[PDB]
Design a protein around this ligand. Sequence first.
Ligand SMILES: Nc1ncnc2c1ncn2[C@@H]1O[C@H](COP(=O)(O)O)[C@@H](O)[C@H]1O
Ligand SMILES: [Mg+2]
Ligand SMILES: [Mg+2]
Lengths: 163, 156
Amino acid sequence: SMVRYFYDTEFIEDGHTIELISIGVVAEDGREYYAVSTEFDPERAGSWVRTHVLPKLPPPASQLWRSRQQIRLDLEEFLRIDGTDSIELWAWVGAYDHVALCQLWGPMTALPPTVPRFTRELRQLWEDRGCPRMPPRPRDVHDALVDARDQLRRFRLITSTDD
Amino acid sequence: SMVRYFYDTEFIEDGHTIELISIGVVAEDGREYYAVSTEFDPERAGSWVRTHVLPKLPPPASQLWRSRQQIRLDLEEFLRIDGTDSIELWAWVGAYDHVALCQLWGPMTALPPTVPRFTRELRQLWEDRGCPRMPPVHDALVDARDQLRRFRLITS
Ligand SMILES: Nc1ncnc2c1ncn2[C@@H]1O[C@H](COP(=O)(O)O)[C@@H](O)[C@H]1O
Ligand SMILES: [Mg+2]
Ligand SMILES: [Mg+2]
């Protein structure tokens, strides 16, 4: 009665705001979501985002480029916020990622009631299980969907252990 | 050695920014920090913050009221960032808390080298230990004290 969703976001954060570039979400059932916001300003991107994140984004004709309102709607459907399953959000650390995701609904008060107010942290789980040796980091390091997938992979390894 | 800090914040957030009202930090050794920012704008507070948060704040002439720079400097001292301690940060449902804390320094890349880039989620630990029974308002130092209390019970 509970579905885990593994997510990662890319963004531009300056100490004041967090402007969403992209989000990838993978459910443990094989479903995938990925989108790139049409509303972030590429000029604001720092040097590191300009070289590592932006070049990996889809061509501007791609239907993966969506408005923020559209991404919100897409996520309400993808997370099945009106279905009977409870939702568990998982990310490597949450924090900035959780806020970026949740800001798609505006303030904290506006988040759909079934969306958890916290993200479970894979990093904490990994450490809780004695820091198992893990597979190496994939090649497309800063693509949000590739990242999310890899997080589901690691979650399965960490939890499918003998313990 | 490793030192755990438990913290909580109050703020005004509007889906874009997080304007820090106050922060409370408690170390495992018993040390406590609390401050209220002289830089948030109470006019911008929603009705919920107006009624539950602001009236719990100290009177205006209390030296608990500090600038954002003073709070940053206060925290670098309280967390002992110049020492050889390793630091763990812990909060309960703390995604926005972690951002609020980090924004005291700027982007997260401005964080001092020894402060961790993530805050451990006390609610995840709780559920991982089988959701043991925890005891029984929106004052950040009282909240932070209470997280340590719960941590000690969860790990007892
Ligand atoms: N029921 C609520 N309505 C509006 N904002 C809230 C609510 N609960 C928590 N918050 C926000 O999250 C911050 C942290 O809350 P707390 O640590 O629960 O005292 C508050 O300063 C509020 O801005
Ligand atoms: Mg990320
Ligand atoms: Mg709190």
